[PDB]
Symmetry: C3
Subunit: 289 residues, 3 copies
């Protein structure tokens, strides 16, 4: 089953993208539930809705918010994805991941991946920010992987490693910075595990997920990271912790992400600022030092 997308298809989409924007971004950022809020911060912002870009997986049903805004965020030139794509939505992983491949041909060397997890480690408060340090791809344990097909050496190897996925440096460099800004609560670090399907994890499941030694759980970020690294992109990311998964038999109270009122607002604002002062710590190709 090869990818319905042929190399010329990306070429095409990059080019296009590169003939409609005087902008050459060095960083792609992927925005997650209640986090497209970061696109307000850009400067020289230039917005293109998927619908409009030649082969772009167009968005489904949930709302009018999902487009590609180019701009300037603190010194570095970025591309930002508002509204990503998930497996639950019906998309083959060669669709969720398409963006990353074009970003490659734009000329992006770094990618920050945001998301809003469920925490599973008993020391996490809704509000927390977790530096993804690692992942657990269950979907991939079974062949649900974006690199599943004939390989495209123009993209990468056949068997890329992942010990290594989320940069040690941008991870040290992130840790330091939370010093810098001198924040209240701590900037967690843990493993991120993915789970596909839309319904939520029951309680035996929350317990497997936790015995597997995961700290947050969600329905995104691993496909995109894998094919990001396949391509040699520098990857680092964070998780906004919204829920706090029940590992005991009880009457859940909970019902939202950010919908309620400050749930995503409050905690989402701090990561948006964090991500924004981090642009500064990301090496600049012109390594003219």
């Amino acid at each position: 089953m090869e990818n319905g997308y042929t190399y010329e298809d990306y070429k095409n989409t990059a080019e296009w993208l590169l003939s409609h924007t005087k902008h050459r971004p060095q960083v792609a950022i992927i925005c997650g539930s209640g986090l497209g809020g970061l696109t307000d911060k850009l400067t020289q912002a230039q917005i293109f809705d998927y619908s409009e870009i030649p082969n772009f997986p167009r968005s489904t049903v949930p709302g009018h918010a999902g487009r590609l805004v180019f701009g300037f965020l603190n010194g570095r030139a970025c591309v930002m994805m508002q509204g990503r794509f998930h497996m639950y939505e019906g998309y083959p992983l060669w669709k969720v991941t398409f963006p990353v491949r074009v970003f490659h041909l734009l000329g992006v060397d770094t990618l920050v991946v945001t998301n809003a997890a469920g925490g599973l480690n008993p020391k996490f408060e809704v509000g927390d920010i977790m530096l993804i340090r690692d992942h657990i791809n269950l979907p991939g344990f079974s062949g649900q992987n974006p690199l599943r097909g004939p390989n495209d050496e123009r993209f990468g190897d056949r068997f890329p490693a992942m010990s290594d996925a989320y940069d040690r440096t941008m991870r040290q460099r992130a840790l330091s910075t939370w010093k810098q800004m001198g924040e209240q609560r701590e900037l967690q670090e843990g493993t991120y595990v993915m789970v596909a399907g839309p319904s939520f994890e029951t309680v035996a499941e929350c317990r497997v997920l936790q015995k597997l030694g995961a700290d947050a759980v969600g329905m995104s970020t691993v496909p995109e990271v894998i094919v990001a690294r396949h391509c040699g992109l520098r990857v680092f990311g964070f998780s906004l912790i919204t829920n706090k998964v029940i590992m005991d038999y009880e009457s859940l109270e909970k019902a939202n992400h950010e919908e309620v009122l400050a749930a995503g607002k409050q905690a989402a604002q701090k990561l948006e600022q964090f991500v924004s002062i981090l642009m500064a710590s990301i090496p600049l190709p012109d390594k003219a030092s």
Copy 2:
């Protein structure tokens, strides 16, 4: 990948169903290996084979037993599914689950799901009845989920919860009743884990299944329960324990479910009676108390 079934398709099938039967059931029951034996108990029984109902996933190869019999079981009006459908049989989960959606439009508020598991908890005898208390969907950990596609708000939310799947009340109300009837052996309670594929679990696998903290294992009941709850149906179910999965290196004796002689007969008879005196404990919409 949306569901090959469009809302009008259910509408159609319900209607039909509702213009061929003077019966309006308030309970659907799903019968599992060696348990269609319950349809003998109905009264005012009205039988319709799948083949005959407009979009109904028609049955495969194993035998002539698989149809939909409406009737009367102890006071409540039920619909009973003799011979369910599995993933191993080749069916997308939007096929295994179709029935549940029509039951929805029939006007069913409750669903009991029977099945015959393998026990994995070292205190279970073949014969036992386990109240499923919870589940572990491995198939779904990877995107094999029935809610995988664009959502149908007429059916439900996008991200339904499952902490909650198997009613606390019908579960207390079941526990009590085994008192009532005053039975010999005890009515177990545990977690039910699903596994797709037809071949049986080897011995390292039986051990993962058990470390994951499951108590019974099978190849059904989770899809149907998930989309049952998606729809706000009251769900409760049981497992008949037929085998007793080997977690040590040895020469299995075993070879059947019920095929042998009383294997499914004996133990299947008690659950059929149990299910039958439970109709009485299920609330009656006319809540005229």
Copy 3:
């Protein structure tokens, strides 16, 4: 979803195979990364490239090495598969497994399955040979199983067991023989777990894989074994251990299988010799004793 291959399709391919070769093999061997090296050992060797056999899944992109050579190895008549097929390559499991079914109709009663794993047990050196003793099919935990469809009683049952997969005798008979030849290092024994997708296991993943109690990991050998046993073939196999999966945060050195220089040569040579003196321990249909 039935198998795109209909019984007449195998018939056809066997026949063909059986009208182009005066050879009737009693053993199929499946060769794995850096192990087609065994075909040099045959005698009366007769080579047929996939491309050429009527329905044979033809090979992809990686190189010119992948064909079916019949011959004579120590007394027994074998068929040897140079270059197997994987899920990562894009193949439905009814494609990876096709070969096994024809071997069935050739008249093969035994199958040895080679492969080159990653070791996960902390006592294994790259170089080691592990007698697969058992398996963990994650792909199958989710419905990615070769027996997924309508059953073909001419092939087998519906629900075949696997406690039993890798022969106790050929396993004792193998153990003894490493005595016989009197080898330096020991002939390991452990559980083999499969994982699909091409990229490599990160470090939380290596830890799940190991908590699941696996000892080696790879991207082959379980489909083929399952449908081999479905068919009542005697199965036994080995793993060549090439890597030594990182279960700690560190800077991997590693980069190859056999590519480097003696990595696959050295260790691959010993298994090829081992497999070769084992032909002698495999019962001979003419049981004229």
